Amino acid sequence: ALSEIETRHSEIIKLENSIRELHDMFMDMAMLVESQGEMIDRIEYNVEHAVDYVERAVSDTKKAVK
Amino acid sequence: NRRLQQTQAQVDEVVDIMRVNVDKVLERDQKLSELDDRADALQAGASQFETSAAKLKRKYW
Amino acid sequence: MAGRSMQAARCPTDELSLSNCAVVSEKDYQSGQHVIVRTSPNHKYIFTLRTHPSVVPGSVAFSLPQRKWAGLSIGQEIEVALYSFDKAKQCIGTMTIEIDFLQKKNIDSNPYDTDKMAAEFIQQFNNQAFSVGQQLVFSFNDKLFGLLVKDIEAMRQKIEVGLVVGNSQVA
Amino acid sequence: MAGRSMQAARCPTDELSLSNCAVVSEKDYQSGQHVIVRTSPNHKYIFTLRTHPSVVPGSVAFSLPQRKWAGLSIGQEIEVALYSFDKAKQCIGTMTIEIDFLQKKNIDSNPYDTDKMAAEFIQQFNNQAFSVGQQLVFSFNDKLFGLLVKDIEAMRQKIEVGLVVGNSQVA
Amino acid sequence: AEAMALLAEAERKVKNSQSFFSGLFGGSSKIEEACEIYARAANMFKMAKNWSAAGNAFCQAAQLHLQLQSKHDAATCFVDAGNAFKKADPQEAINCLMRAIEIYTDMGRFTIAAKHHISIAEIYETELVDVEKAIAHYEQSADYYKGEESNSSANKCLLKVAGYAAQLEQYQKAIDIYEQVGTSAMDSPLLKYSAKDYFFKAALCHFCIDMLNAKLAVQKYEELFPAFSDSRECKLMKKLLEAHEEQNVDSYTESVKEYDSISRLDQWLTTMLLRIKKTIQGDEED
Amino acid sequence: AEAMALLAEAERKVKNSQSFFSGLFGGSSKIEEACEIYARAANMFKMAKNWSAAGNAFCQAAQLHLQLQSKHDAATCFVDAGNAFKKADPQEAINCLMRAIEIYTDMGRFTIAAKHHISIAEIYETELVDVEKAIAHYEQSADYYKGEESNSSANKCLLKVAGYAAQLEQYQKAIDIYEQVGTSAMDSPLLKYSAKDYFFKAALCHFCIDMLNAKLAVQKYEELFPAFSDSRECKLMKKLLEAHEEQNVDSYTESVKEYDSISRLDQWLTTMLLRIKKTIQGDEED
Secondary structure, three states: HHHHHHHHHHHHHHHHHHHHHHHHHHHHHHHHHHHHHHHHHHHHHHHHHHHHHHHHHHHHHHOOOO | OOOHHHHHHHHHHHHHEEEHHHHHHHHHHHHHHHHHHHHHHHHHHHHHHHHHHHHHHHOOO | OOEEEEEEOOOOOOOHHOOEEEEEOOOOOOOOOOHHHHEEOOOOEEEEEEOOOOOOOEEEOOOOHHOOOOOOOOOOEEOOOOOOOOHHHEEEEEEEEOOOOOHHHHHOOOOOOOOHHHHHHHHHHOOEEEEEEEEEEEEEOOEEEEEEEEEEEEEOOOOOOEEEEEEEEEE | OOEEEEEEOOOOOOOOOOOEEEEEOOOOOOHHHHHEEEOOOOOEEEEEEEEOOOOOOOEEEEEEHHHHHOOOOOEEEEEEEOOOOOOOOOOEEEEOOOOOOOOOOOOOOOOOOHHHHHHHHHOOOOEEEOOOEEEEEOOOOOOEEEEEEEEEOOOOOOOEEEEEEEHHHHH | OHHHHHHHHHHOOOOOOOOOOOOOOOHHHHHHHHHHHHHHHHHHHHHHOOOOOHHHHHHHHHHHOOOOHHHHHHHHHHHHHHHHHHOOOOHHHHHHHHHHHHOOOOOOOOOHHHHHHHHHHHHHHHHHOHHHHHHHHHHHHHHHHOOOOOOOHHHHHHHHHHHHHHOOOOHHHHHHHHHHHHOOOOOOOOOOOHHHHHHHHHHHHHOOOOOOHHEEEEEEEEOOOOOOOOHHHHHHHHHHHHHHHHHOOOOHHHHHHHHHHOOOOOOHOOOOHOOOOOOOHHHHHH | HHHHHHHHHOOOOOOOOOOOOOOOOOOOOOHHHHHHHHHHHHHOOOOOOOOHHHHHHHHHHHHHHHHOHHHHEEEEHHHHHHHHHOOOOOOOOHHHHHHHHHHHHHOOOHHHHHHHHHHHHHHHHEEEEEEEHHHHHHHHHHHHHHHHHOOHHHHHHHHHHHHHHHHHHOHHHHHHHHHHHHHHHHHOOOOOOOOOOHHHHHHHHHOOOOOOHHHHHEEEEEEEOOOOOOHHOHHHHHHHHHHHHHHOOOHHHHHHHHHHHOOOOHHHHHHHHHHHHHHHHHHHHO
C-alpha cells in the first residue's frame, strides 16, 4: 500500500538523519576527547615533574638541619 | 513497517545517551582547565622553594 | 502454636505434590495438623501438613501450585503457626471447583466420569484445608488437572476457608 | 555362586546406559558373565555385566530404565549371583520388540529402516540377556528410543528369558 | 595498632600543656600528633566496617586540627568524615558537610565550596527530603560556578534548581531559570543540541498562565521540518497547547500516548504532564 | 654503567651503621642511596630485555626503601616490580601487587588499593585461572569503591563478581548482586538503560528455583511496550519461563535460536542458557 511505503519513507528519512544529529555528537565529542587529551599530556608531565622539584625541596630542607 | 518504528526510538535512545555524555565532557573541561593551570603554577612556587633551599644548604650543611 | 520461623523448600516426591499438603519434617510437626503461613502483613494462607523423611528440620516444602498461590520463594523465611477450624461451622458440604488440564501439552478429547472424580477427590482430599481461589492439582487416573475453588458451603452458610470431611459433596 | 551382597548405584555414563548392561568393576566380575539380581523371593531379574574403570568395588550400577523395571533404587541392598544360561534351549533366534520414542519432546515423522535397526541391534546387544517385559533404551543414529521385549523365541519355542547371539533375528 | 589504643594515646596528647607537662615549650606540636593518631584510628575503623567510629574519629582529628590553626586540611578531614557518615548508619552526614563549606567559603575557595555544596543539596533531597533547602543550595552553588565561568556546572545546578522547583509548585520561577540557562547555552554550538529540552520544560511549566506564555515560548523556539531532534520538543508542544486551549483532555492524553513511543517520559515529565492534564480535566466537567 | 657493578656497590652500603662506621650521625641516606642504585640497575635490566632481573632488582630497591621510612614511594616500586614480572617470564607479579596493596591499605589509601585490587583479580582469572580467589578480590575491591561513593567503578567490579559467580555455581549469590547493582542503578538516570541487562542476568540465574523467582523478577521489572530497549531483556525471558515451567527442552532451545538473531548471544549468556537447558532435561527424567 502507498500509505505504507510512503509513511516508511518519511519515517526512514526521519530515522537516518535522526542518526545524523547523533553522528554529529560523535564528531564533536571525538574532536573534544582528543582536544582535552592534550591537557592530560601536560598533567602527567607536570605532576611527575612537580614531584621532582618537591623531592629536591624536602631533601635540602632535611639536610639543612642535619 | 514494525521493524521500522522499532529501530526508530532505539536510535533516539542512543541520542539521549550522547546528551549525558556531552554533559560529561563539559565536566572534564572544568577540571582539566583550572587544575592543569594550578598544578602548572605549582612547579613555579615549588622550583623557587627548591632555590631558597639551596641557600639554606650552603649555610647550614 | 504461637509461631516459629521456617524456610520454604521444594516438594519431595510427586504424590505429596498431588495432595496439596505442606510437606514438613517429622521432627517439627505431625501429619494432620493445620497451619497459617504468614508472608506479609496482608497475606495469610492456610495449609495442611504431611511429614516426610526428605524434609529438613526447620523448613516447610510446598508444591508448584501452592507456591504460585501463596507467593512464596525458597529462601525466604516465613512464619508458620498452628491453626484450628470451627468444624461446627466451617466444615464443607458443597463446594464448586473449576477443573482444566494443568498442562496443555497433554490435552485430549476423551470423556471423564465426574461421579468417579468427586469420589476419589474426597478419598484423597479428606480432612484438609481449602480456601476460595486456592489453586492445586488433581490426580485422576494419573492424569493431572487444574482445580480452582469457586464457592464453599457448610452443612446453609457460605464461608471463605473450610474443612473438607467425609460427607462432603463436590461439583 | 555363593552370592554376595551389593549396593545399587547409578550408571557411569550414557553409553553403557544405552546397552542395558549391569555395569560393574573389573575387580569383581568380567565383561561377558551373567548375574541374577535378587530383591525378594518373588522377584528375580537377570542382567548382563559390562566392566568399567568408574565402578566402585562391591556395588552394581543400573540405569534409570533398569531401575524402572527391576524396581531398584540408588542405595538399596541387593544380592547378586552368577547365572549360566542354557545354550541348548534358551538361545534367542527371534525376539519381538516394542519400540517408541523415549523423549516425548523429540518425536518426528522421519522414516526408520528396520532392516538397519536389526543389524545394528545384534551388533551391540550381542551375547546379552533379555527377559520378557524388560525395558531399556536403544541408540539408533544418535536417537533415544524406548524398547520393550514383548516376546522371545528359541532357535517355535517360547521362553521367558534368553541369550541374544550373533545369528539372532529381531523384529 | 589497636583503634582504641590510638584513640587513647591521642586523648593524652590533645590538651594545652601546662605546669610540669608544658615544661618550656609546646602547643601545636602535640595537637598535630593527636590529629594523625585519630586519623590512623579512623583508618582501621573504616576497615572493620565500624564507619560510625571511623566518622566520629575523623571528626575528632578534624576538630583538633582546627585547635592548631589549619583550616585547609582540616576541612578536607571534614570531608572524609562526611563521606564516612553518609555511607554509614548515623546522621552527621549533613553537619560535617556544612562544617566543611563554612571553611572552604571563608578561606576563599568557592571552586570547591560549590563542589560539596551540590553534594549537600543532593543529600538534603535524596535523604532528608528537604527540597526547599536543597534548592537554596543548588542555586547559591550555581551562582558560584557561574563566577568561575564554569558555565557547564552552573547549568548542571540550574537544571537541578528548576527541575525540583517545578515539583515544588514554583513553575514560573522554573521557566525563568530555563530561559536563562537556555539563552546561556546557544553561545556554544555544542549545546544547541541540548537547548531543546530547556524550551520543552519551560513550555510545559505553567504557573496557571491564562495567556500564551507557552504559545509564545514555542514560537521563540526555532524549528524546521528537517529537524529530527526537534520532533522531541515543540512538535508535540504545539499539539498540547491546542489540546489545552480547547479543554480537550482526550487530544492531550492521546498525544502524550503517542509521543510516549518515540521518546519515553521520565518521572518529571509525567508528574507535570499529569498536572497539566488535571488543569484541563478540572476545567471541563465543571 | 654495569648492572652487576651497581648491584655490588648497593649491598656493601645497605648495612645498618654502628661503631666507628656510624661516625656521628645515622645512615638514613645510605639506604636511600642503595635504593637509587638498584633502581638504576633494574633500569638497565629492563633495557637489556632481561625483565626477570629488573623485577628482582626493583624488589630489592623496594624492600630497602621500607627499611628507611617511605611506604608511599616504596609501594609504587612494588608496582614497578609487578609490572616487570608481569610482562616478564617469571611469576612474582602477583606477590608484588599483594605487597603493594598491603602498603596502600595500611597507609589509609583505599582508592588506589582498589585500583590495583581489580588488576590483581584480573590477573588471577585470565592468567592464574583462580576464579575462586579472583571473585574475592573483585568483591573486596568493589567494596572499597563503594566506600568511596564511586558507584561507577563499584558497579564495574560487581558485574565481574556476579558474572563469574554465576559461571561457577553461585546463582543466588549472583542474583543478589544484580539486585543490588540494579537498585543502585536507578538512582542515576544515566544508567537507566543498562538496568535491563542486570534484570536479564538476575532472571536467568537460577539457584535451582522451581518457582517463579524469575517470573516474579520479570514482573518486578518496569518495561512498558512504548519503550524499545526492553525488547532485549524480559521479552525473551517470559518465553523462556514458559519453556521452563513446561519442561520443554525444545521451545527453550528454539527461543534462544531465534533470540540469537535479534540479539547476539555472548559467551556468558550461552554458558548459562545451556545450564538452564540442562535443568529442564534434569527435570523431565526425574
